[PDB]
Paper text:
A novel ferritin was recently found in Pseudo-nitzschia multiseries (PmFTN), a marine pennate diatom that plays a major role in global primary production and carbon sequestration into the deep ocean. Ferritin is a 24-mer that forms a hollow sphere, takes up soluble ferrous iron, oxidizes it at di-iron ferroxidase centers, and stores the iron oxide mineral in its central cavity. Sites A and B comprise the conserved ferroxidase active site, and site C forms a pathway leading toward the central cavity where iron storage occurs. The structures confirm the typical ferritin arrangement: 24 subunits assemble to form a hollow spherical shell.
To determine whether occupation of ferroxidase sites and site C is time-dependent, apo-PmFTN crystals were soaked for 5 min, 45 min, 4 h, and overnight in 2 mm ferrous sulfate. Structures of crystals exposed to ferrous iron for 4 h or longer revealed iron bound in all three sites as well as up to two additional sites at the inner surface of the ferritin sphere. The latter two sites may serve as the nucleation site for formation of the mineral core. Coordination of the iron bound in site B is by 2–3 glutamate residues, depending on the subunit. A bridging oxygen atom is modeled between sites A and B and between sites B and C. In addition to Glu-130, the site C iron is coordinated by Glu-47 and Glu-44. In the PmFTN structure soaked aerobically for more than 4 h, Glu-130 is a ligand to iron atoms in sites B and C. In contrast, in the earlier PmFTN structure soaked in iron for 10 min by Marchetti et al., the iron in site C is coordinated by only Glu-44.
Numbering used by the authors:
A (entry chain B), B (entry chain C), C (entry chain A), D (entry chain H), E (entry chain E): 1 to 159
Amino acid sequence: SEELLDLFNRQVTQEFTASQVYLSASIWFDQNDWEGMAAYMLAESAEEREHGLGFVDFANKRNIPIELQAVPAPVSCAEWSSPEDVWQSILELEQANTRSLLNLAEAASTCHDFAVMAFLNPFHLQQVNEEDKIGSILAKVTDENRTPGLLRSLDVVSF
Amino acid sequence: SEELLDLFNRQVTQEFTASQVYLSASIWFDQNDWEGMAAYMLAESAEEREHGLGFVDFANKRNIPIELQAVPAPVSCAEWSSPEDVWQSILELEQANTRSLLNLAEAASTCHDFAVMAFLNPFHLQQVNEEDKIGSILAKVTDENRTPGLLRSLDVVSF
Amino acid sequence: SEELLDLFNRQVTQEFTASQVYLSASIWFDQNDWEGMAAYMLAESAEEREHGLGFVDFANKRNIPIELQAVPAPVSCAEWSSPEDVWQSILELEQANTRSLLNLAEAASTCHDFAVMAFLNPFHLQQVNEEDKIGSILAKVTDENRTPGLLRSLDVVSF
Amino acid sequence: SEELLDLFNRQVTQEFTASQVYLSASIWFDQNDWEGMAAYMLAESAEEREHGLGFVDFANKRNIPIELQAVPAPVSCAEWSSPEDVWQSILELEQANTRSLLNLAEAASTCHDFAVMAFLNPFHLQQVNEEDKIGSILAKVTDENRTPGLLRSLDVVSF
Amino acid sequence: SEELLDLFNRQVTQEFTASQVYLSASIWFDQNDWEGMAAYMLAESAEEREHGLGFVDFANKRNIPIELQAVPAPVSCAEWSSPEDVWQSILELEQANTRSLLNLAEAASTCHDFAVMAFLNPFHLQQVNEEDKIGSILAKVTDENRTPGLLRSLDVVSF
Ligand SMILES: [Fe+3]
Ligand SMILES: [Fe+3]
Ligand SMILES: [Fe+3]
Ligand SMILES: [Fe+3]
Ligand SMILES: [Fe+3]
Ligand SMILES: [Fe+3]
Ligand SMILES: [Fe+3]
Ligand SMILES: [Fe+3]
Ligand SMILES: [Fe+3]
Ligand SMILES: [Fe+3]
Ligand SMILES: [Fe+3]
Ligand SMILES: [Fe+3]
Ligand SMILES: [Fe+3]
Ligand SMILES: [Fe+3]
Ligand SMILES: [Fe+3]
Ligand SMILES: [Fe+3]
Ligand SMILES: [Fe+3]
Ligand SMILES: [Fe+3]
Ligand SMILES: [Fe+3]
Ligand SMILES: [Fe+3]
Ligand SMILES: [Fe+3]
Ligand SMILES: [Fe+3]
């Protein structure tokens, strides 16, 4: 029961952490002249914040007290050296978003908290979509970067 | 006094110079069947000329006497071999436009010429955007040009 | 600091004084059957008052105490004998508007008051446009008045 | 070859030269408060530059190497004293543009270069119309400047 | 002048011949799955035929007797192995179209046939545009085809 309140607060932190990691990915893309991939990461940064705001709102309604935690500095950017590394980190970030949502559902299920589980259902489906989409972009980015300059042409044309 | 009037006049010449350099870039791109990159240089050539006209207009209003210098012949075209060479020269050109605007601003600041400093503000911000845009284009052109033929795709598809 | 607060209040008084001088010019023109010139002077009166109101509003937001001074009777009217005299006083009123703005900016610069400096930039630019516009009307007025009756045609046709 | 290609280049220089002379006329007119005449010179300035770009564009298509030359400092502004002097230099400039075009056409005829002659036709007709329009303006300006101040109403009303 | 009436007739044959060669080119393109290049050759085939009709129409009005000649079997299809060989034959086709226009204009000039020469003028300018466009396409095709598969995206994306 305390576990439920803890996992809920951690979901908020995880959304906001994802939102900062996305922003760090747009900066890296922008600094390295991948403006289409940057615009994509920027849109994801705003979206992750909207998720965390959606959790905060539900918690206020349900009397789950939210104690906002520190949002840590993203640190992967120190090591990114190609768009491929950035997308790989983004895939790992969404895999962790999926794990924390399942931990939260598990706790809500243990507690028979039907309302929290109903709240979570659209996030579960949305995670399935997002992991698939990022997995597919990573596969494209990886295949295209096998020919010098070719990837640059995707950024420009798509995104 | 003298240094500020001089530099204001020189700014006009620098704008027309850059207009002619963009025209010469447009010619090399056309003669070499890069119509996309040519259309872009041609638009920049008109734009630099409009910058110079804006400086002449302000000088007329502020009674800064303008004397039109000769506009020098562009020199870099005899040595351009690939689009990379052209965008590099264009980057350098814009870096000189920037330094030029800084020197004029510095002379305005010493004279406490608040009107001239205010007039220059939007040009300083525009230079930031311009140097970024050209740096970004140069990085693409340099990356795509590592595969024979791939840069033609950039011109055709996206200019 | 004292200087900047005093100068900022003096700037308000200056704009209202200019508003009354323009009103005085409009009266003289009307009484002397120059209704085109009068209507121009009258739009100028309302505009100077709007400048003084913009300074008042900024001062309220920025906690600069405003103490509204008397607005002195315009005094040039008792000696105006031709439209040339009126336009000449108006040009001098605008040159005096410009210097007070520069002095205020100078005090703002010395105090590192970046907000006040930013607030002043569009007035510096507007004064440039105004002095040029009044200098140019005064040139036309002086030149057309060399033939008896001809200036009367300017008022009717183009104001 | 040789002669034709030379003259074709020189035509582009002539257009840009005229463009700078129009611009210097605009400055003179502005500084001396003839805004109506200055707007017209400024329009011609943009128009002469478009002619030169029409020539560059055709040369690119026809494989006529363009080497862009210095655009000479306009010098007639140092001696202009009144609008008649400016319009008189402008007449002379257009008479030189015309002779310049007739020379080029003469070389094309000699070379049997039918394409170049077809390209030149609308320019010959445009020059006939421009010399006529300028002569007419100069006639009006010379006539009106017989009475002090009267020319000042041409600028204000027309233009 | 038998020479003018013969060359005029030959020009009609030449346009219809070009029409067939273009059709032959679209066939090779289509058979080798270059559908966008194919559509462009087809469009040219129709417009060569229209040029031909335009000559026949003028001739009937000017009383130049037209005797329609055999339109020969296109033969370059036997040699073509890649898109480059096709575009190269198309360039030489247009160079020979230009050349026969120039012979025609020459015979017209000799006869002082002012109406014929006036009739040919837009075709001279059109030929300049065509040779340039084809030059440019062939440069792009040759460049892109330096990487296996790359030319296939030009057909898909740009035709
Ligand atoms: Fe998302
Ligand atoms: Fe999304
Ligand atoms: Fe999320
Ligand atoms: Fe997400
Ligand atoms: Fe997404
Ligand atoms: Fe620009
Ligand atoms: Fe510029
Ligand atoms: Fe620029
Ligand atoms: Fe730009
Ligand atoms: Fe005003
Ligand atoms: Fe105003
Ligand atoms: Fe004011
Ligand atoms: Fe004012
Ligand atoms: Fe005004
Ligand atoms: Fe015109
Ligand atoms: Fe011209
Ligand atoms: Fe002209
Ligand atoms: Fe004109
Ligand atoms: Fe065609
Ligand atoms: Fe044809
Ligand atoms: Fe054709
Ligand atoms: Fe075509």
